[PDB]
Amino acid sequence: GKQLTILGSTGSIGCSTLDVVRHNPEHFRVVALVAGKNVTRMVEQCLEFSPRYAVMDDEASAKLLKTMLQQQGSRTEVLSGQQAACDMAALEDVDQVMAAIVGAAGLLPTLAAIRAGKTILLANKESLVTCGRLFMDAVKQSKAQLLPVDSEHNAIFQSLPQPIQHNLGYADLEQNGVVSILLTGSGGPFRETPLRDLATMTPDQACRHPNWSMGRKISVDSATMMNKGLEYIEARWLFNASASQMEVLIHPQSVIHSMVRYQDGSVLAQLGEPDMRTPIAHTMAWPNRVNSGVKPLDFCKLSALTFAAPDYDRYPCLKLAMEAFEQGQAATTALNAANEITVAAFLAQQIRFTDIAALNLSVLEKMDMREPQCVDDVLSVDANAREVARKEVMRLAS
Amino acid sequence: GKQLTILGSTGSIGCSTLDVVRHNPEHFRVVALVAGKNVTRMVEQCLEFSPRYAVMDDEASAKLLKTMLQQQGSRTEVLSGQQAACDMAALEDVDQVMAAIVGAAGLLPTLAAIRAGKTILLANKESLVTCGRLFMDAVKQSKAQLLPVDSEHNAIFQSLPQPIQHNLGYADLEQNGVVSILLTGSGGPFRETPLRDLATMTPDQACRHPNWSMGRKISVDSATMMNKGLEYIEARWLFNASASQMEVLIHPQSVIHSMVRYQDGSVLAQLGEPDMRTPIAHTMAWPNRVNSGVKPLDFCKLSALTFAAPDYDRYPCLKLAMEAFEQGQAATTALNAANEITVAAFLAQQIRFTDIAALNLSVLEKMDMREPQCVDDVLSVDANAREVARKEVMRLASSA
Ligand SMILES: NC(=O)C1=CN([C@@H]2O[C@H](COP(=O)(O)OP(=O)(O)OC[C@H]3O[C@@H](n4cnc5c(N)ncnc54)[C@H](OP(=O)(O)O)[C@@H]3O)[C@@H](O)[C@H]2O)C=CC1
Ligand SMILES: NC(=O)C1=CN([C@@H]2O[C@H](COP(=O)(O)OP(=O)(O)OC[C@H]3O[C@@H](n4cnc5c(N)ncnc54)[C@H](OP(=O)(O)O)[C@@H]3O)[C@@H](O)[C@H]2O)C=CC1
């Protein structure tokens, strides 16, 4: 049915999307797969989904993939490099592009898909956190359909009216009866720990997700709620929402994935299991649905559902991100970059848990750079913020 | 500007819907108001909204109203009788019809609107509980748009995809990725009560609705869960759902009003305040939105949200309703009727709380007439079931 190009096929999101196509072989055809260096995984994916093209970023990995596929008898054409990755995202025949490449490396490929007016299954966070302005403008000009894959943004999308779903980003919320967007989050493992003790929390304590384990980096972001701050930035761009049209709410059980408040008092919400196949399948099948392999949510086996307002004294990173948005893309990409450095430094036990927020603010207070005007400017800000951050860490550890 | 006729304007749903009109005078204009005998209320509504027509089912009430509006310089023309009520629902210029007349009455006025291809703001249980097949077949023929205002059905509607909303009753769930409809209910005040004590519960105890206070009759139906049973029958007709596509869930806090499960695992739900102005406003502005005067729900002042599966030993009436549906409109009509009689008998302390489900079942078992073909047929089944019910109550409240 629909032809897709998967950017970052060997990662977690890429594997989950391939599982969805595996559940619906007659509705989806994989024409191109793009990854980085995981040759072993790529081979298996190429051998199962018969893509016309397979692209590795690393030139060496590509050569290795090539000999592997030939030994296995596959005729999948192998390519290498960023340009090749962008070409796959712009293939004339592809309908959808699952944008799951992490970091700055996902920027150009995602943009190429946007400029080609493809339906974009957006998973890449950096896209809007650092290039929100540039990308939403690009989506408007090409008329590409953005479909948020991230759990929260996807739930919000599903809870939004039809006119906004179509023409996403440049549609008026107020004009479609939407009062605000309710962004939910678990609050992390330190939701009730004495503020006094936050400074002594260990990486292992911080990496225990209150509901289900994830990557260490993301787990820490969930403990500081920087993750929710980043999603706040994305949501603003994605749904064309002002500050007053955004509400952040702690929901410990993570059963409700996010909601939308309406003018008549109605609140629409999306609930489900903690399985990325659900959001992914929603975007791939939109406006229809398909089986994702996810089991039906059992309402009789749930913990009581609760809510609470986030305390900025406990989650300074959340407030930091909200303020950064109002300061511009330079501030948001800098915050994002600084956080990658400080979280990494926390996990490497170079700084304390509470130093993440402190150092993130310190880096931002030293930037004072102009608004990026292109992906190159963003990259420049990113590189600059990381150096400042690495220096901040080093002076702290010494 | 939307032109509307309000069937049963002086009631609770009627006043709430008129309050939505106040908040949006530039979006809605009242053309006709229909009521029964509350002349006092009608006067104020007529003076405030200046309807072109006003009608009272009661001949006398209408007479009095006609003179009061005249002496108070009102241009609204007063009519009377059911025929007039039905005409108001079919006025050519009318766009929407708030079907808020309760009981057997209102069946014909709501059908009139349906046959006229109007947009029906359905706020009347009898329509689908007793005339499910008849009304749904009729909406399919005339292409009338049904918009449920009842809290649960409205929540389900808002949580359904667009293709189903625009072809309500016609479109099928599976094709649109819907696996089931989750109908939620509070469970009543006897949710935790020891099963053996139910027989000694008094009217005052059964009439304590868990969250928001309400009518005695409906409070009792909430305690036996007959209310949810009746809603189950309506939902299957309204959303074209099979038994396996229906799920009944107890949700004590009643914050979530109902939900819908999707093929990919997604569950969509509608939450809000108990205020009926929300659902009413939703249907009136659909596919758009309008301010209803209802303040946003504060998620920080909520009780923990819980869910549970209904135990049929505790809620026999829920099960009776589900079984009645498989038997047709004759059985659902008779069940509804019997329940009116038994609940009223319970309130009058002629029978025990547990005698409601017991007698409801008993009247169903004695019913013979099968599947009505027109509303007149269901009216006949209704009348017959009421009589059988009354005799069962008298037999039990004298002999047994
Ligand atoms: N994990 C989750 O639950 C969610 C993730 N997201 C976001 O969406 C994205 C999904 O990444 P995720 O799957 O989680 O994790 P991974 O980091 O494991 O996936 C990243 C993928 O991108 C590939 N890649 C890395 N660098 C390059 C490059 N330079 N050129 C081309 N491909 C490259 C990797 O290939 P290889 O491994 O072969 O090197 C891998 O397939 C992230 O940006 C994440 O923040 C959003 C919501 C949820
Ligand atoms: N209450 C609620 O929250 C909800 C109710 N519903 C359903 O919708 C309907 C709404 O009734 P509700 O407003 O609650 O309560 P009421 O019984 O107070 O309202 C009924 C209305 O119908 C009028 N009426 C009664 N008999 C006749 C008749 N023979 N001819 C014309 N008009 C007549 C009444 O007029 P008058 O008083 O002047 O005689 C009154 O305006 C009910 O069937 C109910 O089951 C659905 C969802 C919610």
DSSP secondary structure letter of residue A254: -
Pocket residues for ligand 2 (CB within 6 Å)?
Answer: B 8-14, 34-38, 57, 85, 100-102, 105, 123-125, 150, 276
Cβ–Cβ contact A248 with B under 8 A: no
Ligand 1, from A102, A124, A151, A157: best to mutate by most atoms within 8 Å of Cβ?
A102
The CATH label, of 3.40.50.720, 3.10.580.10, 3.30.460.80, 3.20.20.140, for the domain at B1-150 is 3.40.50.720
Closest CA to A88 of A49, A47, A53: A53
Sign of CA dihedral A316, A321, A322, A323: positive
Sign of CA dihedral A282, A283, A287, A290: negative
SS3 B40: helix
CB contact under 8 A, B176 and A289: yes
Contact B48, B76 (CB under 8 A): no
SS3 B53: strand
- Rg over alpha carbons for chain A, rounded to the nearest Å, is 21
Contact B280, B17 (CB under 8 A): yes
Q: In DSSP terms, which residues pair with B249 in a beta bridge?
A: B184
- What does the alpha-carbon distance between residue A334 and residue A338 come to, in Å, rounded to a whole number? 6
Q: Is the peptide bond before A287 cis (omega within 30 degrees of 0)?
A: yes
Closest CA to A57 of A89, A32, A81: A81
- What does the alpha-carbon distance between residue A241 and residue A260 come to, in Å, rounded to a whole number? 12
Report the amino acid identity of residue B251: H
Burial of A203 (0-12, 13-18, 19+ CB in 10 A): middle
DSSP secondary structure letter of residue A371: P
Dihedral through CA A320, CA A324, CA A329, CA A332, nearest 10?
Answer: 0
Touching B: A residues 60-119, CB under 8 Å: none
* Rounded distance from Cα B33 to ligand 2 centre (Å): 13
DSSP of B269-304: EEE--S-THHHHHHHHHTTS----SPPPP-GGG-PP
Burial of A381 (0-12, 13-18, 19+ CB in 10 A): buried
- Residue B268 host element (H or E): strand B267-271
Is A244 annotated among the ligand-binding residues? no
Query: Which residue on chain B is closest to A162 by alpha carbon?
Result: B162
Query: Which residue on chain B is closest to A249 by alpha carbon?
Result: B299
Contact B112, B135 (CB under 8 A): no
- Residue B137 host element (H or E): helix B125-142
Contact B303, B251 (CB under 8 A): no
Sign of CA dihedral A196, A200, A204, A206: positive
DSSP secondary structure letter of residue A297: P
Dihedral through CA B189, CA B191, CA B194, CA B199, nearest 10?
Answer: 50
- Supply A230's token pair: 């980043």
Quickly count: other Cβ atoms within 10 Å of residue B196's Cβ: 8
CB contact under 8 A, A270 and B266: yes
Contacts of B268 (CB under 8 A, 6+ apart): A158, A159, A268, A269, A270, A271, B159, B160, B259, B260, B262
3-class secondary structure per residue, B161-206: CHHHHCCCCCCCCHHHCEEEEEEEECCCCCCCCCHHHHHHCCHHHH
- Supply A110's token pair: 């995602």
Q: Which ligand 2 atom sits closest to the C-alpha of B151?
A: 47
* Rounded distance from Cα A301 to ligand 1 centre (Å): 32
Measured CA to CA in angstroms, residue B179 lies from A77, B241, B246 at distances of: 40, 10, 9
- Supply B36's token pair: 């029964």
Report the amino acid identity of residue A95: D
Resolution (A): 2.2
- What does the alpha-carbon distance between residue B138 and residue B149 come to, in Å, rounded to a whole number? 19
Domain boundaries, chain A: 1-150, 151-311, 312-398
- Rg over alpha carbons for chain B, rounded to the nearest Å, is 21
Long-range contact set of residues A195-199: C-beta below 8 Å, sequence gap at least 24: A195/A313, A195/A314, A198/A314, A198/A353, A198/A354, A199/A352, A199/A353, A199/A354
Cα-Cα end-to-end distance for chain B: 60
The residue behind tokens 């189903």 is B164
* Rounded distance from Cα B205 to ligand 2 centre (Å): 25
DSSP of B72-85: TT--PEEEESHHHH
Long-range contact set of residues A372-375: C-beta below 8 Å, sequence gap at least 24: A372/A130, A372/A131, A372/A133, A372/A134, A372/A329, A372/A330, A372/A333, A374/A134, A375/A107, A375/A108, A375/A111, A375/A131, A375/A134
Quickly count: other Cβ atoms within 10 Å of residue B71's Cβ: 8
CATH class for the region spanning A312-398: mainly alpha
Query: So what's the architecture of B312-400 in CATH?
Result: Orthogonal Bundle (1.10)
* Rounded distance from Cα A37 to ligand 1 centre (Å): 12
* Rounded distance from Cα A10 to ligand 1 centre (Å): 8
Contacts of A281 in chain B (CB under 8 A): 264-265
DSSP secondary structure letter of residue A301: G
- What does the alpha-carbon distance between residue B326 and residue B233 come to, in Å, rounded to a whole number? 10
Q: Is the peptide bond before A296 cis (omega within 30 degrees of 0)?
A: no
Give the distance from residue B59's alpha carbon to the nearest chain A alpha carbon, in angstroms. Answer: 38
Is A24 annotated among the ligand-binding residues? no
A256-269: buried (b, 16+ CB within 10 Å) or exposed (e) per residue?
A: bbbbbbbbbbbbbb
- What does the alpha-carbon distance between residue B385 and residue B334 come to, in Å, rounded to a whole number? 5
Nearest to A264 among B178, B281, B307 (CB): B281
Q: Whose CA is nearest to atom 10 of ligand 1?
A: A100
DSSP secondary structure letter of residue B243: G
DSSP of A112-158: HHHHTTPEEEE--SHHHHHHHHHHHHHHHHHTPPEEE-SHHHHHHHH
- What does the alpha-carbon distance between residue B128 and residue B121 come to, in Å, rounded to a whole number? 13
Give yes or no for residue A125 CB within 6 A of ligand 1. Answer: yes
Query: Phi/psi of residue A186, each to 5°?
Result: -70, -25
The structure was resolved experimentally with X-ray
- What does the alpha-carbon distance between residue A243 and residue A98 come to, in Å, rounded to a whole number? 29
- What does the alpha-carbon distance between residue B63 and residue B40 come to, in Å, rounded to a whole number? 13
Contact A317, A224 (CB under 8 A): yes
Give yes or no for residue A107 CB within 6 A of ligand 1. Answer: no
Give yes or no for residue A14 CB within 6 A of ligand 1. Answer: yes
Give yes or no for residue A12 CB within 6 A of ligand 1. Answer: yes
3-class secondary structure per residue, A21-37: HHHCCCCEEEEEEEECC
SS3 B98: strand
- Supply A115's token pair: 């400029």
Contact B296, B212 (CB under 8 A): no
Long-range contact set of residues A355-358: C-beta below 8 Å, sequence gap at least 24: A355/A396, A356/A220, A356/A224, A356/A226, A356/A317, A357/A224, A357/A226, A357/A316, A357/A317, A357/A320, A358/A316
Q: Whose CA is nearest to atom 45 of ligand 1?
A: A125
Give yes or no for residue A37 CB within 6 A of ligand 1. Answer: yes
Closest CA to B200 of B324, B26, B69, B346: B346
DSSP of B327-384: H-HHHHHHHHHHHHHHHHHHHTTSS-TTHHHHHHHHHHHH------SSHHHHHHHHHH
Dihedral through CA B246, CA B250, CA B255, CA B256, nearest 10?
Answer: -20
- What does the alpha-carbon distance between residue A204 and residue B377 come to, in Å, rounded to a whole number? 71
Measured CA to CA in angstroms, residue A28 lies from A19, A87, A97, A99, A319 at distances of: 11, 20, 12, 16, 41
Q: Whose CA is nearest to atom 2 of ligand 1?
A: A13
Measured CA to CA in angstroms, residue B22 lies from A193, B9, B290 at distances of: 49, 14, 12
Contact B244, B180 (CB under 8 A): yes
CB contact under 8 A, A158 and B266: yes
Give yes or no for residue A155 CB within 6 A of ligand 1. Answer: no
- What does the alpha-carbon distance between residue A382 and residue A339 come to, in Å, rounded to a whole number? 11
- Supply B208's token pair: 């304590």
User: What region does B148 belong to: left with phi over 0, alpha with psi -120 to 50, or beta?
Assistant: beta
Asked if B1-150 and B312-400 have one fold, the answer is no
* Rounded distance from Cα B343 to ligand 2 centre (Å): 18
Query: Phi/psi of residue B198, each to 5°?
Result: -55, -35
Contact B181, B260 (CB under 8 A): yes
- What does the alpha-carbon distance between residue B288 and residue B278 come to, in Å, rounded to a whole number? 13
Quickly count: other Cβ atoms within 10 Å of residue A255's Cβ: 21
The residue behind tokens 């225990």 is A208
Closest CA to A272 of A151, A113, A353, A189: A151
Contacts of B275 in chain A (CB under 8 A): 265
Quickly count: other Cβ atoms within 10 Å of residue B53's Cβ: 19
